[PDB]
Amino acid sequence: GYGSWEIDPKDLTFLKELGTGVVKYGKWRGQYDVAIKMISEDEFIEEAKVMMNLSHEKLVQLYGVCTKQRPIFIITEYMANGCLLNYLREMRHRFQTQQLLEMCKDVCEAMEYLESKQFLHRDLAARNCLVNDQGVVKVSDFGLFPVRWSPPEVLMYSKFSSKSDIWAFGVLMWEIYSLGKMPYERFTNSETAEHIAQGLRLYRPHLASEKVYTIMYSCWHEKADERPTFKILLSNILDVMDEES
Numbered sequence: 098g099y100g101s102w103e104i105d106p107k108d109l110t111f112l113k114e115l116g117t118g119v120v121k122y123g124k125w126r127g128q129y130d131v132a133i134k135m136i137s138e139d140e141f142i143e144e145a146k147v148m149m150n151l152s153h154e155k156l157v158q159l160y161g162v163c164t165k166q167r168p169i170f171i172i173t174e175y176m177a178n179g180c181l182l183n184y185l186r187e188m189r190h191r192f193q194t195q196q197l198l199e200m201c202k203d204v205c206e207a208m209e210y211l212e213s214k215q216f217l218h219r220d221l222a223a224r225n226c227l228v229n230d231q232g233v234v235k236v237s238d239f240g241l242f243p244v245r246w247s248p249p250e251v252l253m254y255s256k257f258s259s260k261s262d263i264w265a266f267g268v269l270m271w272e273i274y275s276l277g278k279m280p281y282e283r284f285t286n287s288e289t290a291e292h293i294a295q296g297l298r299l300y301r302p303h304l305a306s307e308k309v310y311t312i313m314y315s316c317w318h319e320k321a322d323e324r325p326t327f328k329i330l331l332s333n334i335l336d337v338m339d340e341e342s
């Protein structure tokens with residue numbers, strides 16, 4: 098069994114549908130808001146297995162699993178403000194410019210945890226983060242081609258490492274400060290690939306100060322070994338936060 102992670106499906110009260118495996122909102126024992134993912138069977142449950150070993154306040158938290166019933170459920174904490182990408186596009190009336198860097202910090206704390214566990218995300222993007230009722234950003238979908246979030250060594254030789262997560266984080270910062278624009282907005286993936294290899298980088302978004310841009314820019318160093326760690330980036334972000342607020 099999955100031990101204490103096994104949830105009784107009869108403690109769930111399904112309330113609203115959120116998308117379509119199948120994602121719904123509900124309550125667990127009339128008390129806690131949850132998101133519920135419905136469903137191959139063996140590879141679906143892998144997401145949950147990864148999530149049983151990773152726990153952080155900026156990482157979407159597994160609550161449990163229902164595996165003794167078809168279909169199988171995955172249950173997690175509920176993120177009321179949904180996807181970070183849509184939030185950045187549709188919910189600007191709800192956050193200040195200073196808060197953009199706080200969103201960055203939330204993601205950076207999650208990524209520093211993952212990095213310390215020697216665990217790669219491989220798909221870090223605004224689309225793969227979620228936002229709770231307080232505007233706290235959390236990394237999601239880490240239990241499960243993104244050309245626009247990839248460094249050249251990934252594009253050219255499928256060289257995945259901590260430094261490929263670092264590159265994508267920089268692109269995520271760019272997404273945040275550009276209020277959810279698609280990176281390389283006038284290029285196809287193929288053109289993006291070509292231009293990246295030639296050393297073209299994303300421009301400084303208007304809302305980003307020079308200090309902030311330096312932080313995202315450092316994530317895009319051509320040499321993977323020259324890119325910082327999440328530990329370094331977290332310290333860079335706190336520093337700028339102290340200065341710019």
Ligand SMILES: Cc1ccccc1-n1ncc(C(=O)c2cccc(C3CCN(S(C)(=O)=O)CC3)c2)c1N
Pocket residue numbers: 115116117120132133134144157171172173174175176177178179180227237238
């Ligand atoms: C069930 C699950 C298992 C493992 C990892 C993550 C989740 N998960 N899925 C949705 C949510 C949410 O909290 C959530 C709450 C409200 C809204 C939304 C949106 C996000 C984007 N999706 S989508 C993928 O259809 O575009 C629509 C619904 C998501 C959440 N925590």
